[model samples]
Target chain A: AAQSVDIHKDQIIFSEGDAGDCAYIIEKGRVLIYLTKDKEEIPLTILGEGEIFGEMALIDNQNRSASVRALEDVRLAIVTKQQVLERVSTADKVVQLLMRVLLKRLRR
Target chain B: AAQSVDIHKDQIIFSEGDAGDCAYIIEKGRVLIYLTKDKEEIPLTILGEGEIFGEMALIDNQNRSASVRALEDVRLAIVTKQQVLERVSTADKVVQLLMRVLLKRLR
Candidate 1:
């Protein structure tokens, strides 16, 4: 089953260190990734429509490493961890390694 | 079954636009990814050990988007189309999309 949501422009989708209940696939709009330090906002890349975010937590079973905020009105498909973890576990070792490596570097 | 190869330093493993016979997992050493334009080389990124490269072609069924050259004597594990294709085909749609999106932007 899939659940979709509409988030208003400039809204915080989620914050870094929040427990990722699920991952979101951008069906519309854009979002910004960044880290909030002592008093600074460190902006990372902005992911446009048709991209994904908030997945590393589900895949690696960790907290969100950075915050994501909608750049504009956004629509996303919520993919549950259960929907992916099983398939990921059964994928080829090479595929698994590649995913981790790519996810690890997406920050920069 | 898997096959591995050793490539010497400063060798062009493959050039941009070449047909990809297989993907590779770097077992050791580093490689450069780049494009040659107007006699000038545009370097993309240097992938170090334990990284995967040369798979975008196999995934998308296209030619190499960039060239790869060994920075040092390298050992790599070769992954064939047959081994990855069947699994790739049967994977979840999101996984497939994620893989393509990642591979496309990896360059």
Candidate 2:
């Protein structure tokens, strides 16, 4: 029931403060993250090849912290909240993966 | 060549201070956005189908702003930076889309 979404270079994926109901994986290409401070656009991060963003939004307070733009045409893996609950309740692999990733982040 | 990725609930998509290399689109399911403060996980916003995320890394200096996780069994569409540059450099549609999106956010 899960499928990956593809976006071309220079495409807008999401904006800051937007709802954070979904998560993503990088299958290919590069991504750039930006933040706005006092009406000024601040470039916060530039990601290349195999990095992921936007996971903290789930367990945090802010919905979205910044906006994202494409550096090149890229492929992404995606997951939804409902689907996550379903898998977490049913699949051990899902739970394990989530725990590992979460623990790794929090611990670090 | 683009492919959508699948994820299940309780999955950690990305974390704070992690690299930001990709962006996403919701194909199915839901998501929750969050942040951490003093080692506490803070709930932010909840997103549903068709919403996109993690787009600021481009045109900025930082790699990742926050962490993302799955709310339910979900599907996501993805795009990369290199792929984005190409689309912007070659296709007018691509460039226009980006400019419009950016302005919409900035304005």
True contacts kept of each: 0.27, 0.00
List candidate 2 stretches off by more than 4 Å.
A1-108, B89-107
* TM-score, per-candidate, Cα-based: 0.51, 0.42
- Provide the lowest-lDDT 10-residue window in model 1 chain A: A99-108
Kindly list the per-residue Cα lDDT of model 1 for residues B26-45, writing each as its tens digit: 99999999999999999999
Q: A24-66 in candidate 1: lDDT tens per residue?
A: 8899999999998898989997998777887666546779889
| Poorest lDDT segment (10 consecutive residues) of candidate 1 chain B | B98-107
The candidate maximizing lDDT is 1
Q: Candidate 1 - CAPRI tier?
A: incorrect
- State the lDDT of candidate 2 residue by residue for A28-47, as single tens digits: 88888998779987888887
TM-score top scorer: 1
- Highest DockQ: give the candidate number: 1
Chain B: TM-scores of all predictions: 0.77, 0.76
Error of 2 at B52 (Å): 1.1
Q: How accurate is candidate 2 locally (lDDT)?
A: 0.65
